[PDB]
RNA sequence: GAGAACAGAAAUCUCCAGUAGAACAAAAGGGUAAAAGCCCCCUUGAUUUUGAUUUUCAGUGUGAAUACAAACCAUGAAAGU
RNA sequence: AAGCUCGUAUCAGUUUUAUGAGGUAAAGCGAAUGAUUAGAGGUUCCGGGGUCGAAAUGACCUUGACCUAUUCUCAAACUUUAAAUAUGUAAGAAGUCCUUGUUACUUAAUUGAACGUGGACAUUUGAAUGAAGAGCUUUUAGUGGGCCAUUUUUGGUAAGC
């Protein structure tokens, strides 16, 4: 009981990618001018403040970089300590998402089976099978929240065999169609997959690409099992490695 | 489809084998292929399914499989008396870009070395898979003659952008009951491969490579 | 291991088939080869289009997005071993057979 | 009567910084030099300055026992002109050297192979060294029967008529 | 530690010392050297039928574990497991 | 509370004798473990990630890798030895010995294993002291806010914390 203002930033994910981006941006703007101390935690950290003015301007800075929700709490000593609980939306970039049906229909009649493509003050999803994006806001997320299907630990490697195209691009992304194989049975089997993806302008035949393999997956998700069977694909490709040396 | 009392295919095979060599005794080009068109499926909206359903019965004896490999499998290919390739030969093949698009046409297939196939992905560049000639690997202790027999008798159903998949399922040579077994195996493989196990298959036709007017299926 | 880093891929030969087979009668007045290469590169070297001129006032060989955008820009704007054969000959001239 | 200081092993090894055709080349060289097939060896760990990852082959070696050992040793001493330098002698009583440009070993001048180098290492012992190599009732060598540096230097100075400088 | 061309902290080979200072998926503790570690060979006992017992304990349930029985198998020259 | 089957049992908030288990006090570390703390550079010995990027001779970032040529220093989560106090079992008749019956288990076997028939062994029947009778069953009440003292302790400078 010696500060009078506490700000507690949390994100309930094992791999706190958005939180580490936020830490890089706080360190690269130096918004930690007037912090008394910093307490570590398992899922975030607590900043301390002598008066609540630096705390509310920290809230003002955080409300425009990351999709968050904040709540205020009042303490008594017998003059009043204040506590600001901030939660980051627990969906990071390049994560695989199944959307609620009403939200997917109201957000442009997009598919439910999407990929998180950009995180800003809001969050952005994109359909990899047909290039089409959508913007979800923090308040409409936190009105009724959901979780992600797969995080970036079960990304398996793929060896690109052949490329085609369809001509359609939406800027920075050429929607093409590529045939691919797994590097655990490329020299074993004759098993090839055909994926209509947005890694067409960036990929050429013979290299390695990360993706989700849905055909080997035990998913316990009511949003997933409420889908259809034929309209969910086998592989969702996300990113190319491309190590120079 | 779910199988439909195959005596109609039996009479169709008999009429096809009386069309070939009993009304036109042409030169030896026996290939009684089965063409199958599927119905009620969108190519973009549904998954592009594929498999291979290799029946040991053979109909295309004259095939070209330029075995690309190392030195030991090069000696094994020279023993098995088939067209092989070398490492410097494949390096020159990847050097001359126009030579690959021609060697993909002078050959009929390919069979690679489980020691050099994880490079044909990039060294031997694209359009080999677009011509559907990605090489199948062969190990350091498996039989090369048996692998060539399997790569000459291995049939593969792949879903393209068109719903008209045709396969060299038989020859017009002989063996009516073995041909009936081959037609049953191909129909079973297609019906199990499609999404609805019976409903999607519409068109079945037999043709003994001669534009014969005997399908009756 | 073996021949690995031959570099037959990574945008050199593969995924170069994103062409568009449309009506092909683009806006084309003067886009020929020598004046095109001169107006593209007067300070360095460059890489040219597949088959792009204005001889027939039709062009559809801009098989990429930036290719089609630059073609539409110049449409909307009006414009206009091998050393061995010498090395061994030098060495044979250096080996005069008289002086041995 | 038993203490004799004879030749136990002659080991020939060629280490290659690359992992290309050079290892198969040195393998054919060692199979042409010695009368036995050699063995290629995998790298222990990764370095990235030698350009080495683990589990891939680096070097070739072969071991020779019998009269071919002292034949190869006489050829190597003929290359080394019968001179050692008071190093190249272990305290345990083994000795070796290394040979650049292996064309002077009966190897011809073929350009399909080219030029290599080699390391020769000679392991010495006495009779009765089975006691440390058997399975049942293993023991040791007593501290009068072991081969030492001065014993090897004097014995294989007086035979082969060589010289040990410094 | 002592030796071997390039070889230079550190690449491959040879000998001596080495009670474990290594390894055994993950926390920590225990256990292990002709092995429980490392390298090979063969396999599916991660099978069937049901009782009894230990821990938490009301001596209820859930989880986990122990020792037999009646079958069918694996491995090994075998005892065995 | 109601009793029931019996009549000095074989039982005990205890000692003795015999025989197990423990790792705290004390010793000792210097016999192997001997520590947090503020600790200077050595970049292609590592590099964790984060942002862009029609992608790789690919730019932009900062905790740290590793203390490098620093030791005395000591432990409730360190070990060689190891009390006192407290703790398990035994001190016989449901026992011991001799002989030979059963079995579909076990042995190479006429061997064993378990349970027996017949016979021998009471002044002490196998240490001490005590024993208000011993054993068994059914049924039901209230209670399920506790507090204080000596000693041994944990967290908080510390408290009637
Ligand atoms: Mg239980
Ligand atoms: Mg003490
Ligand atoms: Mg009796
Ligand atoms: Mg009660
Ligand atoms: Mg009460």
| DSSP labels, B98-151 | HHHHHHHHH-S--EEETTTTTTTTTSS-TTTTTTT-PPEEE-SSS-HHHHHHHH
In this structure, what DSSP letter does residue B24 have? Answer: B
Cα distance between residue B210 and residue C5, in whole Å: 48
Cα distance between residue A172 and residue A126, in whole Å: 13
Q: Any chain D CB within 8 A of the CB of C95?
A: no
User: C-alpha angle C69/C71/C73, rounded to 5°?
Assistant: 70
Beta strands, E only, B1-120: 33-38, 50-52, 67-68, 84-85, 111-113
Cα distance between residue D74 and residue D113, in whole Å: 24
Contact A41, A10 (CB under 8 A): yes
Contact A90, A13 (CB under 8 A): yes
Q: Is A11 exposed, middle or buried (0-12, 13-18, 19+ CB in 10 A)?
A: buried
Strand B67-68 and strand B84-85: the pairing is parallel
Cα distance between residue B151 and residue B140, in whole Å: 17
Tell me the Cα Rg of chain D. 18
Cα distance between residue B134 and residue B111, in whole Å: 8
Contact B155, B168 (CB under 8 A): yes
Give C75's Cβ-side CA count (13 Å radius): 17
- How far CA B158 is from CA of B50, B52, B85, B132, C34, in Å, comes to 4, 8, 28, 10, 47
Interface of chain B against chain C, CB under 8 Å?
87, 90-91, 94-95, 97, 116, 119, 122-126
Strand partners, A174: A169
Chain CA centroid to CA D146, Å: 20
Q: Residue B22 corresponds to which tokens in the numbers above?
A: 């009993």
- How far CA D1 is from CA of D21, D82, D126, D156, in Å, comes to 50, 28, 11, 18
Chain CA centroid to CA A154, Å: 14
- How far CA B26 is from CA of A184, B20, B183, B207, B210, in Å, comes to 48, 8, 24, 15, 9
**CA nearest to C57, candidates C33, C82, C30, C79:** C30
Determine the nucleotide nearest to D60 by Cα–C1' distance. E12
Residue D132 (CA) to nucleotide E24 (C1'), in angstroms, measures 30
**CA nearest to A159, candidates A204, A209, A119, A115:** A209
Contact A156, A213 (CB under 8 A): yes
**CA nearest to A160, candidates A111, A200, A209, A114:** A209
Cα distance between residue D10 and residue D77, in whole Å: 13
Cα distance between residue D147 and residue D45, in whole Å: 34
Q: Residue A15 corresponds to which tokens in the numbers above?
A: 């791999």
**CA nearest to B206, candidates B186, B191, B192, B190:** B186
Residues of C in contact with A206 (CB under 8 A): 8-10, 14
Cα distance between residue C28 and residue A37, in whole Å: 68
Contact D117, D29 (CB under 8 A): no
Is the CB of D49 within 7 Å of strand E?
yes
For helices B7-19 and B176-193, angle between their N-to-C axes, nearest 10 degrees: 120
Q: How far is the CA of C90 from the centre of ligand 4 (A)?
A: 115
Query: Each residue of D92-114: b (16+ CB within 10 Å) or e?
Result: ebbbbbebeebeebeeeeeeebe
Residues of D in contact with C3 (CB under 8 A): none
In this structure, what DSSP letter does residue A17 have? Answer: H
Give C81's Cβ-side CA count (13 Å radius): 0
Q: Is A45 helix (H, G, I), strand (E, B) or coil?
A: strand
Residues of B in contact with A161 (CB under 8 A): 121, 129, 134
Strand arrangement, sheet containing D95-100: D39-42, D57-64, D6-15, D117-125, D95-100
Q: What are phi and psi of C79, to 5 degrees?
A: -140, 120
C-alpha distance from C33 to closest chain D C-alpha (Å): 45
Kindly state the helix (H) or strand (E) to which residue D79 belongs, with its residue range.
helix D67-79
Chain length of chain A: 245
Q: What are phi and psi of C55, to 5 degrees?
A: -70, -40
Task: Identify which of A187, A205, A231 has the shortest CB distance to residue B137.
Answer: A187
Q: What are phi and psi of B105, to 5 degrees?
A: -105, -30
Strand A113-119 and strand A96-98: the pairing is antiparallel
Would you tell me how many other CB atoms lie within 10 Å of the CB of residue B138?
25
Cα distance between residue A116 and residue A92, in whole Å: 7
Cα distance between residue D119 and residue D39, in whole Å: 15
Cα distance between residue B106 and residue A7, in whole Å: 72
Chains that touch B (3 or more CB pairs under 8 A): A, C
**CA nearest to A110, candidates A90, A89, A129, A138:** A129
Residues of A in contact with C7 (CB under 8 A): none
The contacts of residue A111 (CB under 8 Å, 6+ apart) are A99, A104, A127, A129, A130, A231
Cα distance between residue B34 and residue B186, in whole Å: 9
Q: Do C15 and A204 touch (CB under 8 A)?
A: yes
In this structure, what DSSP letter does residue A37 have? Answer: -
Tell me the Cα Rg of chain C. 23
End-to-end distance of chain A based on CA atoms, in angstroms? 53
Q: What are phi and psi of A225, to 5 degrees?
A: -75, -10
Strand partners, A6: A48, A83
Contact D94, D5 (CB under 8 A): no
Strand D6-15 and strand D117-125: the pairing is antiparallel
Cα distance between residue D80 and residue A202, in whole Å: 59
Nearest CA in chain A to B196: A230
Would you tell me how many other CB atoms lie within 10 Å of the CB of residue C28?
17
Contact C10, A207 (CB under 8 A): yes
Q: Residue B69 corresponds to which tokens in the numbers above?
A: 């490999």
Q: Which of residues 83-122 of D touch strand E (CB under 7 A)?
A: 87-92, 94-100, 116-121
Q: Is A64 exposed, middle or buried (0-12, 13-18, 19+ CB in 10 A)?
A: exposed
């Amino acid at each position: 009981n010696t500060w009078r203002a506490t700000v507690q930033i949390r994100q309930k994910v094992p791999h706190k990618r958005t939180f580490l981006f936020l830490e890089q941006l706080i360190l690269k703007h130096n918004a930690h001018v007037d912090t008394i101390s910093i307490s570590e935690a398992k899922d975030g950290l607590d900043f301390f403040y002598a008066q609540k003015n630096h705390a509310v301007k920290m809230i003002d800075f955080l409300n425009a970089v990351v999709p968050i929700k904040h709540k205020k709490s009042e303490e008594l000593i017998s003059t009043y300590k204040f506590s600001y609980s901030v939660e980051i939306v627990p969906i990071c970039k390049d994560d695989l998402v199944v959307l609620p049906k009403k939200l997917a229909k109201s957000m442009g009649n997009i598919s439910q089976f999407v990929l998180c493509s950009k995180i800003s003050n809001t969050v952005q999803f994109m359909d990899p099978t047909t290039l089409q994006t959508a913007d979800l806001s923090p308040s409409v997320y936190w009105r009724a929240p959901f979780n992600a299907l797969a995080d970036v630990t079960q990304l398996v490697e793929f060896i690109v065999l052949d490329v085609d195209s369809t001509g359609i691009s939406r800027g920075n992304r050429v929607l093409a169609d590529i045939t691919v194989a797994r590097t655990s049975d490329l020299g074993v089997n004759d098993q090839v997959y055909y994926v209509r993806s947005h890694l067409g302008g960036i990929c050429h035949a013979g290299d390695s690409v990360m993706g989700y393999f849905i055909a080997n997956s035990n998913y316990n998700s009511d949003l997933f099992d409420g889908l259809n069977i034929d309209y969910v694909p086998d592989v969702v490709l996300v990113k190319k490695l491309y190590q120079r040396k | 489809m779910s199988k439909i009392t195959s005596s109609q295919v039996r009479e169709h095979v008999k009429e096809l084998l009386k069309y070939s060599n009993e009304t036109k005794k042409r030169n030896f080009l026996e290939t009684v292929e089965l063409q199958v068109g599927l119905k009620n499926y969108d190519p973009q909206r549904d998954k592009r399914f594929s498999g291979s359903l290799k029946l040991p019965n053979c109909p295309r004896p004259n095939m070209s499989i330029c075995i690309f490999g190392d030195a030991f499998d090069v000696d094994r290919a020279k023993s098995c008396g088939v067209d092989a390739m070398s490492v410097d030969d494949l390096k020159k093949l990847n050097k001359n870009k126009k030579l690959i698009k021609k060697l993909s046409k002078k050959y009929n297939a390919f069979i690679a070395s489980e020691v050099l196939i994880k490079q044909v992905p990039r060294l031997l560049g694209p359009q080999l898979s677009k011509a559907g000639k990605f090489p199948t690997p062969v190990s350091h202790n498996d039989d090369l003659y048996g692998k060539v027999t399997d790569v000459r008798s291995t049939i593969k159903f792949q879903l393209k952008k068109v719903l008209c998949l045709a396969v060299a399922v038989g020859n017009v040579e002989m063996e009516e009951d073995v041909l009936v077994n081959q037609i049953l195996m191909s129909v079973n493989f297609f019906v199990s491969l499609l999404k609805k196990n019976w409903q999607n298959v519409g068109s079945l036709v037999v043709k003994s490579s001669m534009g014969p007017a005997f399908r009756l299926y | 291991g073996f021949h690995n880093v031959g570099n037959i891929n990574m945008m050199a030969q593969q995924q170069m088939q994103q062409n568009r087979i449309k009506i092909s009668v683009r806006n084309w007045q003067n886009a020929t080869m020598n004046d095109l290469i001169n107006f593209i590169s007067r300070n360095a070297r460059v890489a040219v289009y597949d088959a792009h001129v204005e001889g027939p006032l039709v062009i559809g060989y801009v098989n990429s997005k930036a290719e089609a955008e630059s073609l539409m820009k110049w449409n909307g704007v009006r414009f206009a071993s091998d050393t061995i054969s010498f090395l061994r000959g030098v060495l044979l001239k250096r080996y005069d057979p008289q002086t041995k | 009567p038993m203490r004799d200081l004879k030749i136990e092993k002659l080991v020939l090894n060629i280490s290659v910084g690359e992992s290309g055709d050079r290892l198969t080349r040195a393998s054919k060289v060692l199979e042409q030099l010695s009368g036995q097939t050699p063995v290629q060896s995998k790298a222990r760990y990764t370095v990235r300055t030698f350009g080495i990852r683990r589990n891939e082959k680096i070097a070739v070696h072969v071991t020779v026992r019998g009269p071919k050992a002292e034949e190869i040793l006489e050829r190597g001493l003929k290359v080394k002109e019968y001179q050692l330098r008071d190093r190249n002698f272990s305290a345990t009583g083994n000795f070796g050297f290394g040979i650049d440009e292996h064309i002077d070993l009966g190897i011809k001048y073929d350009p399909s192979i080219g030029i290599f180098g080699m390391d020769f290492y000679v392991v010495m012992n006495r009779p009765g060294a089975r006691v440390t190599r058997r399975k049942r009732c293993k023991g040791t060598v007593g501290n009068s029967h072991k081969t030492t540096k001065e014993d090897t230097v004097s014995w294989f100075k007086q035979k082969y008529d060589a010289d040990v400088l410094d």
